[PDB]
Amino acid sequence: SQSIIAYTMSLGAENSVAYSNNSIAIPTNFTISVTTEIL
C-alpha cells in the first residue's frame, strides 16, 4: 500500500484574484509571525 510515484511539478496552489474596476479588499485582522534566518 506504499510505493514511489513520479509526477510533474506543481508550482503552487492555483489562485486568482478578481480585478474589478471598483473592488478593494482590505484585511480586518492581523497576525504576528516569527520566521528564522540562519547565516
Binding site: 492581523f30 497576525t31 504576528i32 509571525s33 516569527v34 528564522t36 540562519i38
Partner: protein, 48 residues
C-alpha cells in the same frame, strides 16, 4: 494584550519547531562538514 499573546505563542512555537525539525540549520552544518571533509581529504591524499 492580543498581540502580546500572539508574540508569546510564536516565541513558544519557534523553540518547538527547532527542537522537532530534523535539521533547519543546514547551513552552519553544511560549512562545518565542508571544511572537515576538505581537511580529511587533505590527510587521506597523503596515504597515496
Amino acid at each position: 494584550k492580543l498581540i502580546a499573546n500572539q508574540f508569546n505563542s510564536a516565541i513558544g512555537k519557534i523553540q518547538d519547531s527547532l527542537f522537532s525539525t530534523p535539521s533547519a540549520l543546514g547551513k552552519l552544518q553544511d560549512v562545518v562538514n565542508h571544511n572537515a571533509q576538505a581537511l580529511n581529504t587533505l590527510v587521506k591524499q597523503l596515504s597515496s
